[PDB]
């Protein structure tokens, strides 16, 4: 029958859901999506060929519930899977009111306010990171099959310039856009890596000028759809510690320098704890300090191979199947 997937806002909620949508489709189920206007599901969900049902101070919360109650009443789904955003709260409750089974998924290291409110009413609570829910099943984060790379995906580092990928993420954090050109100018041009910077949608034009003025050289973009290609090119990542970028770095088996209820700092810790990632706090690390940290791994790239070997082992390839298996066991 029909399946309802509720997710929106940023890529961290929309992308694990698009991967779940592909899995339900291969099993012979009709997937329908639950979103809100303005969010990024309006860009991605219609492109995937999937039906987008849109939802819109307590009287405002009830308006969202009526619309969600209607969408569920019309689709009579076998299961409803929530993944994050404003949508899951009124959507997940609507699912219970109509006696339709509900499964929730938490991408982050600390559970979200909606996921904490919805967990007691869900049949299965799927978690990405361990210890996030005090109880439930640890599936990991559902990552796009294409983002899974082996240690043969890239050329040896020895006698080659390192490729540096700077990630936004989904909206394109600002800071990083400022810190990177200033920091990269202090790194000798003999060791300076090749740069691909994913700035914001409104910050791509300005981040280009920032690199241009300090005389660096980078391929600055607002957003990259060709992510499997972006990860294969990269030897090192300097990123934001959003749930999916963290889980994708493991699938891609990539060393990272992460700049993160302190959800991101905890997300970064799961890489850091094993030696897969390196924690660089925003409030502390200046342009001089990032340059010095980069300089040591460029001078000694064998460091990147150990970080990559550890990252590859933290990947959870069955994250998508087990989330969908948890939905279809209760459906
Ligand atoms: C600033 C902010 O509020 N960030 C939050 C946001 O992160 P956000 O969703 O922005 O970042 P995440 O790392 O969670 O997810 C990024 C997703 O967007 C994709 N991507 C991004 C850029 C691009 O060029 N192409 C592309 O496909 C990534 O491959 C990945 O699939 O949502 C999450 C909520 O669950 C949290 O972890 C973050 O703290």
Swiss-Prot record:
Catalytic activity of the protein: di-trans,octa-cis-undecaprenyl diphospho-N-acetyl-alpha-D-muramoyl-L-alanyl-D-glutamyl-meso-2,6-diaminopimeloyl-D-alanyl-D-alanine + UDP-N-acetyl-alpha-D-glucosamine = di-trans,octa-cis-undecaprenyl diphospho-[N-acetyl-alpha-D-glucosaminyl-(1->4)]-N-acetyl-alpha-D-muramoyl-L-alanyl-D-glutamyl-meso-2,6-diaminopimeloyl-D-alanyl-D-alanine + UDP + H(+)
Gene Ontology molecular-function annotations: UDP-N-acetyl-D-glucosamine:N-acetylmuramoyl-L-alanyl-D-glutamyl-meso-2,6-diaminopimelyl-D-alanyl-D-alanine-diphosphoundecaprenol 4-beta-N-acetylglucosaminlytransferase activity; undecaprenyldiphospho-muramoylpentapeptide beta-N-acetylglucosaminyltransferase activity
Keyword set, alphabetical order: Cell cycle, Cell division, Cell inner membrane, Cell membrane, Cell shape, Cell wall biogenesis/degradation, Glycosyltransferase, Membrane, Peptidoglycan synthesis, Transferase
Compartment(s) where it occurs, according to its Swiss-Prot or TrEMBL record: Cell inner membrane
Family matches, as InterPro entries: GlcNAc_MurG (IPR006009), Glyco_trans_28_C (IPR007235), GlycoTrans_28_N (IPR004276)
Topology relative to the membrane: Peripheral membrane protein
EC number(s) on file: 2.4.1.227
Gene3D superfamilies: Glycogen Phosphorylase B
Pathway: Cell wall biogenesis; peptidoglycan biosynthesis
Residues that hold UDP-N-acetyl-alpha-D-glucosamine according to the record: 10-12, 108, 144, 170, 224, 243-248, 264
Designated name of the protein: UDP-N-acetylglucosamine--N-acetylmuramyl-(pentapeptide) pyrophosphoryl-undecaprenol N-acetylglucosamine transferase
